[PDB]
Amino acid sequence: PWPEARHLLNTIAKSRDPMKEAAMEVGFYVPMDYSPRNEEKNYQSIWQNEITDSQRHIYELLVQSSEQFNNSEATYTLSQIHLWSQYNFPHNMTLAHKYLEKFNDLTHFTNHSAIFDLAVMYATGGCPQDSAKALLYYQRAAQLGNLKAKQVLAYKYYSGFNVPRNFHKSLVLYRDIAEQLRKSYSRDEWDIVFPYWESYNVRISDFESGLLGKGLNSVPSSTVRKRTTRDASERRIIRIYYAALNDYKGTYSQSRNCERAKNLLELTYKEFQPHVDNLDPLQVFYYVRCLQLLGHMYFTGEGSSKPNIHMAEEILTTSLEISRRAQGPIGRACIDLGLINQYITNNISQAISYYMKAMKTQANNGIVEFQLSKLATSFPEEKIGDPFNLMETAYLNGFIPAIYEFAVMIESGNSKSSVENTAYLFKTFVDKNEAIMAPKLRTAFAALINDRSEVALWAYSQLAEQGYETAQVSAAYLMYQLPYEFEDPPRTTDQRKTLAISYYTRAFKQGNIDAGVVAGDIYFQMQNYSKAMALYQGAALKYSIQAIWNLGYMHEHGLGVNRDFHLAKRYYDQVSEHDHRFYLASKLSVLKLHLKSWLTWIT
Amino acid sequence: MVPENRRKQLAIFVVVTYLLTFYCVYSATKTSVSFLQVTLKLNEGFNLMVLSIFILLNSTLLWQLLTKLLFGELRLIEHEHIFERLPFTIINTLFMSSLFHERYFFTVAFFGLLLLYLKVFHWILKDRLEALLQSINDSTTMKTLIFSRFSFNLVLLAVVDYQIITRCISSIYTNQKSDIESTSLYLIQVMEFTMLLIDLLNLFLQTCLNFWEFYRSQQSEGKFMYEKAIDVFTRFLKTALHLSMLIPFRMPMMLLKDVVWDILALYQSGTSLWKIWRNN
C-alpha cells in the first residue's frame, strides 16, 4: 500500500516556512503555562474538525501499512510527521516515542538520526530521564559517525556537566569535527568568498521586553539585524538604497531576495549615470554606496547565474574614480578589487597596495588579514608583517576560516599552547560555523511564527544540548518566564520546572548572567532558600544589580541567614552605589528598614 | 485669602491629583516584574512630573495647615504683604535652583521650599509684632504670659533654624569630598538661614527695646536713635558675615549680588551715622 501512499504524499508540501514566502510580496504568542489535559483536548478537537477527509484516508492507510507490515519506511515518515508537525498534522510526544521505539527495534541500531532523537528524548524526560541510556545512545551514534552526536559529547566533556571534567577527549572530538567541516568545503568558497548563510542564532525574548525586565539586564540585547533604516529627489536615493540593502541582507521576519535587488540596482545605475554631476551635496554618497553594493553582487554572482568579472571590474573602477572626489568610503570597493586581481588575474603588487590601503578601514571584517597571511606564507621576501600576527588580528576580528587556520598554527607550535585554549578555539569555531551543525534554527522560527509552539520547544531543546547558549535560553524561556508581580505563578508540572532550572543553570555557567538570576528566582518560588544564595552570589560577583537588591531582600527576612540588618543596609548601600538611576529605590528600602527598626524599638 | 469658588477648584485639583497619581502608580505596577523595575519606571519623565505635582500640592497643604495652627488666622494686611513680596524671593529661588543643573535637582528644590516657608513665617511674625504694637493695651502689663506666647513663637523659629544650620555645618565639616559644589550649595543654605537668623536677632532686640521702654514708662532720649543704631549694627553683622563667608569660597556671582546691596545699605548707614553725629 506504500507506493500509492507516497504518490499521494507527494502532493501536500509538508511545511511552508513563511520567512521565505514573505519575500514575494509582525509578532507571535508564547504560552505561559502547560497542562496535559488541555493539550489532549486540543488534539481531540483538531482531529475532529480541522483535518480534511483526504488526509483522513491517507493517514489511515498509512497506519494500516505501518501496523500490518513492518514496512520500516512508513514508520519513519509517520514518525517525522507526528514529531515535526508536517503535512498539517499536530504534535504528539508519546506516539512519536512509540514509533521511534518500533523503528529502533526494526533497524537494530543502524539508522543514526533515529538513535540521536531517541537519546535526546531519553535525556530530556519529555516522553523520567536517565543519563546512562542517553550516554550509551550518544556513544552508539558517535560510532556510525554522526556529527551532532560527537559535538554534544564534546560539549558534555568540556563543560563538566553530568560527567567529570576532561579536556583531552573534548579536544580530540573538536579536532575531528573541525577536520570534517573543513573537508566539507570546496577550494573556491573557502579561498575566494565565503557563502553567506543567514544567521538565526539569536535568542528568543529580545524582540519583546527582555529577561527580568527592561533596562535592568546587564548583557546587551542580541538582535543584530532587523529592518535597517534611518524630499522628492533627495529622499528617493535614501529610499532606493535602503530598499536594496534590506532586500539583500535578509531580516528575521522576511528572508532575502536577490534578483529583485539586482534588477533594481541595474535600472537605477543605468538611468542615473549620465548626469551624476549635479548630486554633489549628499546624494553622491548613497549613489557610490549603491555602486559598491551592486559591484560586490556582480562579483559574487548571487542573484544571477554566474559572476561577471569584467563588468564588475569596470563598474568598480568607475565607482572608485567617483569616490576619489568627495573622498567617500572606499572599504568594500578596494577590498573586492584586491580580491579579483589576486586570483582572477595574477597582478599581485596592486593587490598588496589595495590591501594596505584598505587595512585600517571599518568595512573589512577579517578577509584582508587572511589574504595577507596566506600571501606572506607563499612569498616571505615581501617583508609584509608577520603571519602569526595577521592570524591573531583576523581571529580576534571574527572571520570564520581564520579561526581554523589560527587553531592549526597555534597547535603546531610553543606559543603558550595550553590545551584549554586549543579546546576553546575549536569549540568556538564549531559552534560558529552554524551552517551544517545547527540548520534547524530556521525551521524552529518557522514553526514558531505559525503558532505551532510545542515543536519549537522540541527543536530548541535538542539544540541546547549541542552547547548553543542561545538555544538554551530560548528553550528555558519557552518553558518558564518570570511572572508579573501580584499575579499567580505558572501552573506547569514539577518536571518542566526542574528541567528549566538545569537549562538556565548551564546557560549561566556558559557565560550568560541573567539566567542565573532567573534560576535563583525559580528556587525562591519553589521555596528552597538554600541553593538560592549560591546562585545569587554567583550573579552578584559579576555586578548584577537586581541580584544585589534581591540578596539584600533575602537577608533582611528570616529566611536562610537570620535577620542581620547590618549586612542588609550594607548591600543596599552597595546597590545604590554601583549605579545611578536606582538611588530612590535603595533609599526607600533603607527607609522601610529603619521604619521596621523603630516599630521594633517600640516593643 | 480663599474664596469659596477657589476652594471648590482646590477640591477638584486635589482629588484629580490623587486620582492621577494612584492610576499611574497602579499602571506602572501591574506592568512590571520587580520593585526595582517599577522604581525605574516611576523615574520616567511624565510620571515623575505627576509625582512631583503630588508632592508639591501635599506639601503646600501641610504648610498651609501648619500656618493656620501657628499664626491662627491671617489679616488682610499680612496677606497683601505676602502677595506683594513673594515673587521677588520666588525668582531668587528660581535663580539659585537654575544655578545648579540636573545633577543637583531634588535636594535644591527641597531646601528652597523649606527656606521659602521660613521667610514667609518671618514676614508674618514681623507683621504680627507690628500688629501687637498697634493693638497694645496698657490695662495689663507686658506679662510674662503674652510675652511668653510671642517669644515662644520667636524661639521656635530660632531653635529650628539653629538646629538646621548646625546640622548643615556639621555635614559640611565632615564631608570634605570631591563634590565641593554640594558643599557650596550647603553654604548657600547657611547664608540664607543666617540672614534669617540676623532678622530674628534684630526683631528680638527691637522687641526687648520696646518692652524695656514699656517697663520704664510703667515703673518710672529719643528711641529712634537707639533703633537706628541697632539696625545699622545688625547691618554691620550681616556685611561682616557675608564677606567672611563668601570670600573664602571665592564666588563670582553671589558675592557681587549681595555686596552691592550691602554697600547701598552702608551708604544709608553713613547717612544715619552723620545724623548720629548731629545728635551727638
mmCIF file of C-alpha atoms in Angstrom, chain A residues 215-216 484-486 545-546 549 581-582 585 588, chain B residues 29-37 39-40 43:
data_model
loop_
_atom_site.group_PDB
_atom_site.id
_atom_site.type_symbol
_atom_site.label_atom_id
_atom_site.label_comp_id
_atom_site.label_asym_id
_atom_site.label_seq_id
_atom_site.Cartn_x
_atom_site.Cartn_y
_atom_site.Cartn_z
ATOM 1 C CA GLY A 215 16.911 48.476 31.203
ATOM 2 C CA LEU A 216 17.950 46.162 34.031
ATOM 3 C CA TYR A 484 4.305 39.909 36.589
ATOM 4 C CA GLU A 485 4.115 40.735 40.282
ATOM 5 C CA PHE A 486 0.849 40.363 42.200
ATOM 6 C CA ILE A 545 22.096 44.964 40.248
ATOM 7 C CA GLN A 546 18.813 43.080 40.627
ATOM 8 C CA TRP A 549 18.953 44.028 45.746
ATOM 9 C CA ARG A 581 19.289 55.776 38.452
ATOM 10 C CA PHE A 582 18.455 53.343 41.266
ATOM 11 C CA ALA A 585 14.767 52.582 45.362
ATOM 12 C CA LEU A 588 13.232 53.866 50.096
ATOM 13 C CA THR B 29 2.911 48.368 38.949
ATOM 14 C CA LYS B 30 0.916 45.788 37.004
ATOM 15 C CA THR B 31 3.268 46.131 34.026
ATOM 16 C CA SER B 32 6.458 45.349 35.970
ATOM 17 C CA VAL B 33 8.486 42.399 37.238
ATOM 18 C CA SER B 34 10.170 43.602 40.428
ATOM 19 C CA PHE B 35 10.176 46.634 42.717
ATOM 20 C CA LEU B 36 13.355 47.956 41.132
ATOM 21 C CA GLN B 37 11.808 47.966 37.668
ATOM 22 C CA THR B 39 11.057 52.379 40.500
ATOM 23 C CA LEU B 40 12.906 52.854 37.220
ATOM 24 C CA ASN B 43 11.505 57.773 37.453
#
